Amino acid sequence: YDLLDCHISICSPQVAQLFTDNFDYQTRDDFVRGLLVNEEILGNQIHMHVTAKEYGARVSNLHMYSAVCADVIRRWVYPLTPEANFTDSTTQSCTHSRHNIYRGPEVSLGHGSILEENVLLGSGTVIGSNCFITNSVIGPGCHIGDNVVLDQTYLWQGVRVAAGAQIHQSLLCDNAEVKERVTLKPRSVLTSQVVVGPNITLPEGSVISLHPPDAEEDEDDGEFS
Amino acid sequence: QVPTRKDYGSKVSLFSHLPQYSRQNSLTQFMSIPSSVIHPAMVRLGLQYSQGLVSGSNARCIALLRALQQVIQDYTTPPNEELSRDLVNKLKPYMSFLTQCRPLSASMHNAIKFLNKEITSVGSSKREEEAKSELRAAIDRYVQEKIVLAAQAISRFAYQKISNGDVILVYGCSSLVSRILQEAWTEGRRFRVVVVDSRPWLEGRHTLRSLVHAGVPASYLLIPAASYVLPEVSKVLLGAHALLANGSVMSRVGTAQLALVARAHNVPVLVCCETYKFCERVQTDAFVSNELDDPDDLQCKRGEHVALANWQNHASLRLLNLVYDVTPPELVDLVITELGMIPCSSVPVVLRVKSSD
Amino acid sequence: GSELSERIESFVETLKRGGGPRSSEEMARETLGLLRQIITDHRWSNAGELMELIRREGRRMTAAQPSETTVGNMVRRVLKIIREEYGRLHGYAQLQSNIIEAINELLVELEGTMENIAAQALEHIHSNEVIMTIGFSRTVEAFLKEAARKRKFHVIVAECAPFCQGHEMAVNLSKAGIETTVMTDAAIFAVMSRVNKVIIGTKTILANGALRAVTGTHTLALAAKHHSTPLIVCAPMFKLSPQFPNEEDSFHKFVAPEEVLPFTEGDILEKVSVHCPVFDYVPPELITLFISNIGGNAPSYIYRLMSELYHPDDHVL
Amino acid sequence: MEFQAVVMAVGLPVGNKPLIWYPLNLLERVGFEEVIVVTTRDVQKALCAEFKMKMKPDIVCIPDDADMGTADSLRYIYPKLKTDVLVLSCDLITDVALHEVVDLFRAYDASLAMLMRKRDFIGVDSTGKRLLFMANEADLDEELVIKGSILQKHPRIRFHTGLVDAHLYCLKKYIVDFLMENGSITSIRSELIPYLVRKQFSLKSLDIYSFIKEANTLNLAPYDACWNACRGDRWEDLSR
Amino acid sequence: KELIEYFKSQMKEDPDMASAVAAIRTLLEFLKRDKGETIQGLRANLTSAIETLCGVDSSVAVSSGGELFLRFISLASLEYSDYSKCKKIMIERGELFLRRISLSRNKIADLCHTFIKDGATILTHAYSRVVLRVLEAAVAAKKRFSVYVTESQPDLSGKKMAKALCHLNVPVTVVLDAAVGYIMEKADLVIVGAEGVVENGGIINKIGTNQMAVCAKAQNKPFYVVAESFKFVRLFPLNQQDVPDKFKYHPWVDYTAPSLITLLFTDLGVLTPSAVSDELIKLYL
Incomplete structure (x- = not known):
């Protein structure tokens, strides 16, 4: 039970042969669950390798996304680190400070803004005064207000956070916006320029997007309908 | 009766007088299964000491006193003898067997001394089970006060010193320092703790657990990263295992080195020790009296390049794993005892208070 | 042409991914061969155009890995060689073969470095001596394994906690019979009372005499300064860098924290902050003597080797 | 005294030597100054007179009933035991050094410690000493089931198939107290193993330990292992 | 009130x-x-x-x-x-x-002035009656020495100390308070009066003391501290902020490490700095 699946299954071309034969095998665990229960027909014993000194995982939740991102920021997938810039792009290069603080170019921090643990700042993300950012990834070209807290949060590019906003364990997608006097709860998802009006606190289960039936609701300049 | 354990591996030329045993073999291969020479509780204590299951000094002394309670409860009086001489004549093979299992800590030595002073001070006018219940009551009252009340007093004296927004550095595994940090986190102080660990015990992970089950933000690193983290560290809190007559701190092996780097980074160190872990015995280095663990404990798993696997085939190869070392009294600032905040230069003087003089 | 950029990009992502190759003298030979391939596969009229070119690819190669300074100081040494030849030819067409023969002279200088340190190694070892080293370096183990040919002494190889590479040094020195003692990294001040001198290597010598090296050796330098024992830094002259310590905080190389705290620790890995710096900073006041292939030098003499091997106009690269 | 050895006889000395002599000799080698032996009455209630004809220092032979089990054998000697119980059997000739199971009983303070030597599928933790599961298809309707708490607390469990019980146990006082308080158990090899293995999967709990030896093997009640007993006693009893 | x-x-x-x-x-x-x-x-x-x-x-x-x-x-x-x-x-x-x-x-005065050599140099801090009493007993014991007193900027009392010593007709010189490291090599002994002694052996004094103490440490000069027994404090300041902030108010109090202090001169006698903790643990706060 001590085996986290990395889904890096290296194969022989007999896998494609058995997938051509068995049309009912839809995905990987279907293939292994059909291969293990039928042994004297189509024998094909699957072998295994266990890694103890290197990292490997994938993402399928907000939980897997948050855990893998917290492992990337805490350098568990070294050499693949954001300050190394393995993708050669000038808009993604960072410098590694103490306590895993990654700082990009032209950030323009303000007075009183404290970064304590596991903070990444992209290209051109302006940060106001008296902020408190921890365990979080901030995208490039963002705008942060004043007297804010941001813990375990994932801000993507183009977002705009006003003053007094308190954001915990959430995810903000591209070009987002939030007004003042807002406080976010854990496991909140904001998706592709959803604006949240003032004096509107979201519950724990919160996914708001532009599509009505796929998300829980659709927001506007006012959060009430 | 009781033989001696064979010395394992090639000993260091500087550590030729100190014994170096192995954990894979034990002394009970040539002993009775109903233990006749040694008490069954004593051989259970020796087996749980030699295998490394009880390694903390307070836990070692507590399990030693529990085994002594089981010895006294299962003790009878022979004819033509007194209890005060037959008990000290019978406990010395038990302590010698415990020494042959593992070199004794200073808390165990002071517990042996206090038990000898207690069981020689009983009167002949008392009965058998009367004196047995008196000695059991003295033992658990003694361990009750000079563990729990001393730990509470040391934690109360440490609460008025730890500030808010502080950074505390700890090393190793100990009950007292983790209790201090737990009571300071629950009492109202907001701080983060940096844990320093060293090979091959990896016991600080234990107190790392004791920092995350209480909700304290923690940081785990090793003794090469202590030089990197000590510019950030404001205060260093350490758990002393033994305090010597010149103010020296006999403790786990990464403490005097850590105290020297902390003094080089202008960070004051704060050892935490009780009066029953003191010594009138004094030493100035880690060479005249020290514990030697197994030479087979230093090998590692870095792929499949174990270089120290067949180390005994090399005749000119020496392997050494030190347990305790000695800090000079020039490096340690605080000694937080239940009587207050004393320097190291006050360590024997409190002993003059603790000898009822 | 194109094959030049093939080899350059292969070198760049080789430095980006891992340590390729393992030891540094092969890497310096690769850097000098790549630089002679760059100067033999291009066209220029002025030396300054090749100077701007080499500055650009030096910026690229140190942007591949900022922690490893050997490629950068080799680019800077080639730049100063080009500057010296342009200065001695200015006071035109024969410049290229002059830089070729100068790079060949630097290669003959560089292949015979460790054996020159071994030739001058007998001037620092007496009989029945206690030596303590840290990490693993082929220069120091070659030093000790040939100094044991005429002397008999003791070497205490202390392992380093991120990667215990001192076990390889212990089993390589124990084959020569130098009475090797293996210890941890926490007992250094526990054994500093008996160690007579400290003979270590390094990764990069800085401009002020300071040095980055394998981690835990600043503690060893502090203990050896406390006990007033001399420090022997057996280091070649391609680990000499003009990069100052306080410069954009890009000093330490942080690696994966698996070797400190494994992934099977539990749910407590989420609320913990584990750092693993594999390098450490030693100031020049905690260093007694450097040993290079040209001889022994003081930490109060590193500025002269800096001005003799590097130019102050190329510190930004 | 720490242990009181109990030797069971439920269906005996058919071989090159007496089958009762090897366990008693093993016991009397390392300590065990007083041995409680249980006589057989299922096949014939006359072997006790054959049991009192040896030359040991001290034996305790008791009469027993015909229809009885090992749990009933421990419940029969309950008012005469005051310490830990170390159970044996007659047809068990072992060259294994006995002190490993006693070291595992003392070092971890286990509630039951047993010895096996290479049907019954057992699962033991990766340390190789503490067991977690054991089952056979004599009492299993389904194929195999594993509790979730023992997988959350112990993520890798090594299973073994060819291991046979040598019937050398180490019981504590409260185990025999619960066995006397629960009279529904008749065969202690299937009762004290499975119920304590289920109760250990609860913090404060009990510990069960096992030693898998690779030196010799035990025997059986039938004639399947009666051919190798003489070959074992011709080459293993010369040192004893 | x-x-x-x-x-x-x-x-x-x-x-x-x-x-x-x-x-x-x-x-x-x-x-x-x-x-x-x-x-x-x-x-x-x-x-x-x-x-x-x-x-x-x-x-x-x-x-x-x-x-x-x-x-x-x-x-x-x-x-x-x-x-x-x-x-x-x-x-x-x-x-x-x-x-x-x-x-x-x-x-x-009679138990402290015995240490001061004849023909020597004294370095002293701001005004207190104890060092005047020690020095007047030293000149009553027929001793000649040159005195260098710190000017002690926040309240110019070292100049008042120098005036009280010129009325005593002894050679005293107001030395610049930024020059206590300039005249340390000529000062063979540094005797100072303290206003409070903490438990380990360190002292609580006026702000210009502790730096002089480390000038006594790098230049190997015996830093003598003179104080009575009622100035014994049951505190442990670790850093310079660890003194209580109500006694500060430009700081007014510097904590001096006990390793920088050679001797104490109390009513119990000439003591090692470890004696203050002995008196404070048999006194029990």
């Missing part, structure tokens, strides 16, 4: 009188004027008295003397069971303790 008025009347009537002895006399007068037959009722009144004496005077010796007086009251309350005889016992014992304290400075 009659307590602060009596304290200022006792402190302003004599310029040769310290603040701590005036605070102990004020505490004894308040205990004689209390007449409350209660142990805790007297302890709370004494604690409010020391609260007033610490809110009025920001000196460390005032709170130190009040804590010693409170420990003396606790010892006298724990000794005698009945309070009626214990009140007169406290009054007589406190009067005899004040009589012993009022002769302490002369004892320091």
Whole structure:
């Protein structure tokens, strides 16, 4: 039970042969669950390798996304680190400070803004005064207000956070916006320029997007309908 | 009766007088299964000491006193003898067997001394089970006060010193320092703790657990990263295992080195020790009296390049794993005892208070 | 042409991914061969155009890995060689073969470095001596394994906690019979009372005499300064860098924290902050003597080797 | 005294030597100054007179009933035991050094410690000493089931198939107290193993330990292992 | 508030009188004027008295003397069971303790001035009566030496010390307070008066002391510290902020490491700095 699946299954071309034969095998665990229960027909014993000194995982939740991102920021997938810039792009290069603080170019921090643990700042993300950012990834070209807290949060590019906003364990997608006097709860998802009006606190289960039936609701300049 | 354990591996030329045993073999291969020479509780204590299951000094002394309670409860009086001489004549093979299992800590030595002073001070006018219940009551009252009340007093004296927004550095595994940090986190102080660990015990992970089950933000690193983290560290809190007559701190092996780097980074160190872990015995280095663990404990798993696997085939190869070392009294600032905040230069003087003089 | 950029990009992502190759003298030979391939596969009229070119690819190669300074100081040494030849030819067409023969002279200088340190190694070892080293370096183990040919002494190889590479040094020195003692990294001040001198290597010598090296050796330098024992830094002259310590905080190389705290620790890995710096900073006041292939030098003499091997106009690269 | 050895006889000395002599000799080698032996009455209630004809220092032979089990054998000697119980059997000739199971009983303070030597599928933790599961298809309707708490607390469990019980146990006082308080158990090899293995999967709990030896093997009640007993006693009893 | 008025009347009537002895006399007068037959009722009144004496005077010796007086009251309350005889016992014992304290400075002078060589150089800090008493006993013992006194910028009292020494007709020189490292190599001994001694052996003094102490450490000069026994404080300042901030108010108090201090000169004698912790643990706060 001590085996986290990395889904890096290296194969022989007999896998494609058995997938051509068995049309009912839809995905990987279907293939292994059909291969293990039928042994004297189509024998094909699957072998295994266990890694103890290197990292490997994938993402399928907000939980897997948050855990893998917290492992990337805490350098568990070294050499693949954001300050190394393995993708050669000038808009993604960072410098590694103490306590895993990654700082990009032209950030323009303000007075009183404290970064304590596991903070990444992209290209051109302006940060106001008296902020408190921890365990979080901030995208490039963002705008942060004043007297804010941001813990375990994932801000993507183009977002705009006003003053007094308190954001915990959430995810903000591209070009987002939030007004003042807002406080976010854990496991909140904001998706592709959803604006949240003032004096509107979201519950724990919160996914708001532009599509009505796929998300829980659709927001506007006012959060009430 | 009781033989001696064979010395394992090639000993260091500087550590030729100190014994170096192995954990894979034990002394009970040539002993009775109903233990006749040694008490069954004593051989259970020796087996749980030699295998490394009880390694903390307070836990070692507590399990030693529990085994002594089981010895006294299962003790009878022979004819033509007194209890005060037959008990000290019978406990010395038990302590010698415990020494042959593992070199004794200073808390165990002071517990042996206090038990000898207690069981020689009983009167002949008392009965058998009367004196047995008196000695059991003295033992658990003694361990009750000079563990729990001393730990509470040391934690109360440490609460008025730890500030808010502080950074505390700890090393190793100990009950007292983790209790201090737990009571300071629950009492109202907001701080983060940096844990320093060293090979091959990896016991600080234990107190790392004791920092995350209480909700304290923690940081785990090793003794090469202590030089990197000590510019950030404001205060260093350490758990002393033994305090010597010149103010020296006999403790786990990464403490005097850590105290020297902390003094080089202008960070004051704060050892935490009780009066029953003191010594009138004094030493100035880690060479005249020290514990030697197994030479087979230093090998590692870095792929499949174990270089120290067949180390005994090399005749000119020496392997050494030190347990305790000695800090000079020039490096340690605080000694937080239940009587207050004393320097190291006050360590024997409190002993003059603790000898009822 | 194109094959030049093939080899350059292969070198760049080789430095980006891992340590390729393992030891540094092969890497310096690769850097000098790549630089002679760059100067033999291009066209220029002025030396300054090749100077701007080499500055650009030096910026690229140190942007591949900022922690490893050997490629950068080799680019800077080639730049100063080009500057010296342009200065001695200015006071035109024969410049290229002059830089070729100068790079060949630097290669003959560089292949015979460790054996020159071994030739001058007998001037620092007496009989029945206690030596303590840290990490693993082929220069120091070659030093000790040939100094044991005429002397008999003791070497205490202390392992380093991120990667215990001192076990390889212990089993390589124990084959020569130098009475090797293996210890941890926490007992250094526990054994500093008996160690007579400290003979270590390094990764990069800085401009002020300071040095980055394998981690835990600043503690060893502090203990050896406390006990007033001399420090022997057996280091070649391609680990000499003009990069100052306080410069954009890009000093330490942080690696994966698996070797400190494994992934099977539990749910407590989420609320913990584990750092693993594999390098450490030693100031020049905690260093007694450097040993290079040209001889022994003081930490109060590193500025002269800096001005003799590097130019102050190329510190930004 | 720490242990009181109990030797069971439920269906005996058919071989090159007496089958009762090897366990008693093993016991009397390392300590065990007083041995409680249980006589057989299922096949014939006359072997006790054959049991009192040896030359040991001290034996305790008791009469027993015909229809009885090992749990009933421990419940029969309950008012005469005051310490830990170390159970044996007659047809068990072992060259294994006995002190490993006693070291595992003392070092971890286990509630039951047993010895096996290479049907019954057992699962033991990766340390190789503490067991977690054991089952056979004599009492299993389904194929195999594993509790979730023992997988959350112990993520890798090594299973073994060819291991046979040598019937050398180490019981504590409260185990025999619960066995006397629960009279529904008749065969202690299937009762004290499975119920304590289920109760250990609860913090404060009990510990069960096992030693898998690779030196010799035990025997059986039938004639399947009666051919190798003489070959074992011709080459293993010369040192004893 | 009659307590602060009596304290200022006792402190302003004599310029040769310290603040701590005036605070102990004020505490004894308040205990004689209390007449409350209660142990805790007297302890709370004494604690409010020391609260007033610490809110009025920001000196460390005032709170130190009040804590010693409170420990003396606790010892006298724990000794005698009945309070009626214990009140007169406290009054007589406190009067005899004040009589012993009022002769302490002369004892320091005859037991301290023996160390100063003839033809030497003295380095001294700001104004206090103790170093004047030691130096006047030294010149009464027929000794000649050159004196360098720190000007002590926040209140120019070292110049008043130099004026009091020129009226004594001794060679004294006001040296610049930024020049205590300039004249350290000529100062073969550095004797200084302190206003409070913490438990490990360090001292609480005026702000220009501790740097001079490290000038005594790098240049191997014996840094002698002179202080009485009522200045013993049951505190442990680790860093320079770890002193209580009510005694600071440009800082006014510097903590001096006990490793930088050679000797102490108290009423018990010439002591190692480890003796203060011995007296403070048999005194038990």
